[PDB]
Structure formats: structure tokens, C-alpha cells
Amino acid sequence: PLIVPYNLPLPGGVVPRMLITILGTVKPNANRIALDFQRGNDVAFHFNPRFNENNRRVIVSNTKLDNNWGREERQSVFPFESGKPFKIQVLVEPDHFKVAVNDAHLLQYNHRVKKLNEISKLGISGDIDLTSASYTMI
Numbered sequence: 001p002l003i004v005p006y007n008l009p010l011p012g013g014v015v016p017r018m019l020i021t022i023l024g025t026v027k028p029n030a031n032r033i034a035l036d037f038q039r040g041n042d043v044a045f046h047f048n049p050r051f052n053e054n055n056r057r058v059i060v061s062n063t064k065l066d067n068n069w070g071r072e073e074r075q076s077v078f079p080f081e082s083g084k085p086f087k088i089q090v091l092v093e094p095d096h097f098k099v100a101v102n103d104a105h106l107l108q109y110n111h112r113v114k115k116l117n118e119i120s121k122l123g124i125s126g127d128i129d130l131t132s133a134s135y136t137m138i
């Protein structure tokens, strides 16, 4: 598999109709996964499945500006399974990131970082075997 943490450059930043596809397998006894869409040191979109927060499974989404985390957005619909293969699809739309897991819509995350062309890398980390990380224009 690919080395984790993995940096996927996004040349010239994100743009509407850009589709990012991550394929991997969750480790057995996973604690977390993280996708970090970055604008320099800022994190425009942090997508963070948590397998055991107070014995609950939750996805936390947030933005980091000037080294400070913002207001969390929490999704209790939790499509990831310890030990099992997954597909994350992130479609950039004009006003949000649109996330599907295993071909099922999961959540939208409204753009807080407005300079889309400056969000020029994606960090992939946490308790996975990473199979592939790629992008295409639809």
C-alpha cells in the first residue's frame, strides 16, 4: 500500500467539478482517520472519523485558521468499518465539499476558506492501509 501519512498535491488548488477518490482499508481496532485539505498552514476542510469518542462513532469536520480550530460540524452517520475496504469521494462544488462513502452521500461541508485555488494539498492520515489517492475533473 501507499505510505501514511500521504500528501497528495492538488496543482493550482481545488475547483468546482474536481473529484478526489481515496481507496483504503480500515485497520482492525482503528481509532481515527483524517483527510486535511490544506491552504499553507491552514486546514480548509478537516474530515475526521473517530471510532471511539466516549464509546460513540462520529465524524468531526472543521477548519483550522492561524493555528486555531473553529466550530466543529458532527455527523453521527458512520459508514466506516474496522477491518474493511472503503472508498471516499470528495466532489468540490461551488459552495461546499460533497462527501460520499462507498457510493452513498454522507455530508456537505460549506466553504469557510473562500480562496479555493489556494487549497493546494490533501493530507491523508490515520489507522488505514492506503490503496490509492487520485483526482479527476468531471
Ligand SMILES: OC[C@H]1O[C@@H](O[C@H]2[C@H](O)[C@@H](O)[C@H](O)O[C@@H]2CO)[C@H](O)[C@@H](O)[C@H]1O
Pocket (backbone or CB within 6 Å): 046, 048, 060, 061, 062, 069, 070, 072
Ligand atoms: O475540531 C477538530 C479537531 O478536534 C481536536 O479535538 C478537540 C475535540 O473534538 C473537542 O471535543 C475538544 O473539546 O477539544 C479538542 C481539542 O481542540 C483534535 O485535537 C484535532 O486533531 C481535530 O480533530
Ligand SMILES: [Cl-]
Pocket (backbone or CB within 6 Å): 063, 064, 065, 069, 070, 071, 112
Ligand atoms: Cl472556522
Ligand SMILES: [Cl-]
Pocket (backbone or CB within 6 Å): 112, 113, 114, 115
Ligand atoms: Cl480565504
Ligand SMILES: [Cl-]
Pocket (backbone or CB within 6 Å): 133, 134, 135, 136
Ligand atoms: Cl491523479
